[PDB]
Write a protein that binds this ligand. Structure first.
Ligand SMILES: CN(C)CCCN1CCN(Cc2cccc(C(=O)O)n2)CCN(Cc2cccc(C(=O)O)n2)CC1
Ligand SMILES: [Cl-]
Ligand SMILES: [Cl-]
Ligand SMILES: [Cl-]
Ligand SMILES: [Cl-]
Ligand SMILES: [Cl-]
Ligand SMILES: [Cl-]
Ligand code: NA
Ligand SMILES: [Tb+3]
Length: 129
């Protein structure tokens, strides 16, 4: 599924991401834009052999199992394919675990380089939330 911007905002809000660990909703929408372009089916292979999955490009090195990342963990206890569904529940629950780790949203390199410090509220402007 390719979400619309306000569609994704509404879904993230309903699953409790707005203000989660102090990160306003626009931070999460911005992260999703530059991680996946709002595409739940996005996948990208990393240099180390791990793969990033879904709307928030969650990495198999730590968070999900894809059977092809030797030595990795599965801390969200989920197949990585579950992060590609049109229903973002699994991605949101896993994201909550990720952002609760010591580094906050810096875990998402695209958030750090493209969202952090910018006017992230723009990403929810005009949305009926
Ligand atoms: C930059 N890296 C690519 C991020 C990877 C972060 N983790 C690295 C090792 N991590 C341990 C660790 C050691 C020292 C620093 C950090 C950190 O900055 O989080 N984490 C294992 C635990 N896993 C989840 C978890 C669950 C509960 C508590 C904690 C925690 O207290 O850190 N962590 C997170 C993976
Ligand atoms: Cl957009
Ligand atoms: Cl694996
Ligand atoms: Cl594990
Ligand atoms: Cl959904
Ligand atoms: Cl933080
Ligand atoms: Cl915001
Ligand atoms: Na893994
Ligand atoms: Tb950690």
């Amino acid at each position: 599924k390719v979400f619309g911007r306000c569609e994704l905002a509404a879904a993230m809000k309903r699953h409790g991401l707005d203000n989660y660990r102090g990160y306003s909703l626009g931070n999460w929408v911005c992260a999703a834009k530059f991680e996946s372009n709002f595409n739940t089916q996005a996948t990208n292979r990393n240099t180390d052999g791990s793969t990033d999955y879904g709307i928030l490009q969650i990495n198999s090195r730590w968070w999900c199992n894809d059977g092809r990342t030797p030595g990795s963990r599965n801390l969200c206890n989920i197949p990585c394919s579950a992060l590609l569904s049109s229903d973002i529940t699994a991605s949101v629950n896993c994201a909550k675990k990720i952002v609760s780790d010591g580094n906050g949203m810096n875990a998402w390199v695209a958030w750090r380089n493209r969202c952090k410090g910018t006017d992230v509220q723009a990403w929810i402007r005009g949305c009926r939330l």
